[PDB]
Paper text:
We therefore prepare TDG, TD139 and [name] (C2-asymmetric, containing one 4-fluorophenyl-triazole at C3) and study their binding interactions with human galectins-1, -3 and -7 by X-ray crystallography, isothermal titration calorimetry (ITC) and NMR spectroscopy. We show that a great number of interactions between TD139 and galectins-1 and -7 exist in subsite E than in subsite B, and that [name] displays two binding modes toward the galectins, with a preference for subsites C–E in galectins-1 and -7 and subsites B–D in galectin-3. Especially for galectins-1 and -7, subsite B is less important for binding than is subsite E. Thio-digalactoside moiety of [name] is thus supposed to bind with subsites C and D of galectins-1 and -7, and their E subsites accommodate the 4-fluorophenyl-triazole moiety, which would be consistent with the observed enthalpy change between TDG and [name] (ΔΔHTAZTDG-TDG = −4.5 and −2.4 kcal/mol for galectins-1 and -7, respectively). The signal patterns are similar to those observed in the TD139 complexes, indicating that the fluorophenyl-triazole extension of [name] can bind to both B and E subsites in solution in a similar manner as di-substituted TD139 to simultaneously occupy both sites. The area covered by each distinct resonance in the spectra of [name] complexes also reveals that [name] prefers the subsite E-binding mode when in complex with galectins-1 and -7, in agreement with the complex structures previously mentioned. Interestingly the subsite B-binding mode is dominant in the case of galectin-3. These galectin-specific binding modes are further supported by additional X-ray crystal structures of [name] in complex with galectins-3 and -7. In the case of [name], the chemical shift perturbations could be extracted by monitoring the crosspeak positions as a function of [name] concentration, although coalescence is observed for several crosspeaks with intermediate ligand-to-protein ratios, leading to the unfavorable line broadening during titration.
Galectins are small, soluble lectins characterised by conserved β-galactoside-binding site (subsites C and D) within their carbohydrate-recognition domains (CRD, ~130 amino acid residues), and they can form multivalent lattices with membrane-associated glycosylated ligands. All the observed CRDs of galectin family adopt a typical β-sandwich fold composed of two antiparallel β-sheets of six strands (S1–S6, S-sheet) and five strands (F1–F5, F-sheet). Concave surface of S-sheet contains conserved amino residues and forms a primary binding groove to which specific glycans up to a length of tetrasaccharide are bound. In this model, the best structurally characterised subsites C and D are responsible for recognition of the β-galactoside-containing disaccharides, whereas the other subsites (A, B and E) remain poorly understood regarding how they contribute to ligand binding interactions.
Residue numbers in the entry:
A (entry chain B): 3 to 135
B (entry chain A): 1 to 135
């Protein structure tokens, strides 16, 4: 079952999501979604999707049940059996995705920041904690 | 053998910027500081002066503008100890700086100077820095 956390103050520039976890001995992939509602198929302002089995990291958004243009990151800053700490940082012009001690990708806003209400973490990952700062 | 830090921020900092500071407060420590400065000159204006004072058990927040300090704000107690490592997040938002210490929200410092003026991060005083990263 995917982990879900509400954003009680919504998200604004300055909102920081810290996700600590572990990638299982062989995970295929896992994802972090920033969702605009609790209903099934709700829009995703951000879909962050490390894929171990294809060695990619896909970024996308979704509206009206339709994915958008995929953006991909440089390499795979995740490995099976190793713990991670991801920061998702909301700025005025996009989301900064930080893995470890390095800026990994910058994803420009497609949907209004204000519509975001939910963080979802699913797929093959062992979730240690989701913290919102 | 204190280990300080100076980093330039040529493009400045925008709402949604994270300064992560990790280090050790050494056994004899009196105090240390994290400054967000507007220039490289001596006594530059400061959007943020963050000042854990181990010797007085206070954490002071202030700004400096046109050469004059503002009114100090104080956080709730001192989440630092001599002989112990720490992690501080200084998070810039639309309305101010959020200080996070040891994974807990600690203080919120409303902007006094425009964020666009910040040009430099300096960390010094009685601290042995592990790392300073800006995201
Ligand atoms: O956009 C995010 C979503 O991606 C899909 S998977 C997706 O399916 C697409 C079908 O048109 C393409 O096959 C796409 N694609 C494109 C490429 C591609 C194309 C050109 C160059 C190069 F390097 C790669 N490879 N795969 C693939 O990623 C997931 O099911 C969903 O959960 C979510 O992550």
């Amino acid at each position: 079952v995917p982990h879900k956390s509400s954003l009680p103050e919504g998200i604004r520039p300055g909102t920081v999501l810290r996700i600590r976890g572990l990638v299982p001995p062989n995970a295929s992939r896992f994802h972090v979604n920033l969702l605009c509602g609790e209903e099934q198929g709700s829009d995703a302002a951000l879909h962050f999707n490390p894929r171990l089995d294809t060695s990619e990291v896909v970024f996308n958004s979704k509206e009206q049940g339709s994915w958008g243009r995929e953006e991909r990151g440089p390499g795979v800053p995740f490995q099976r059996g190793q713990p991670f700490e991801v920061l998702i940082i909301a700025s005025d012009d996009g989301f900064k995705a930080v893995v470890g001690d390095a800026q990994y990708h910058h994803f420009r806003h497609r949907l209004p920041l204000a519509r975001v209400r939910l963080v979802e973490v699913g797929g093959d990952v062992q979730l240690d904690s989701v913290r919102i700062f």
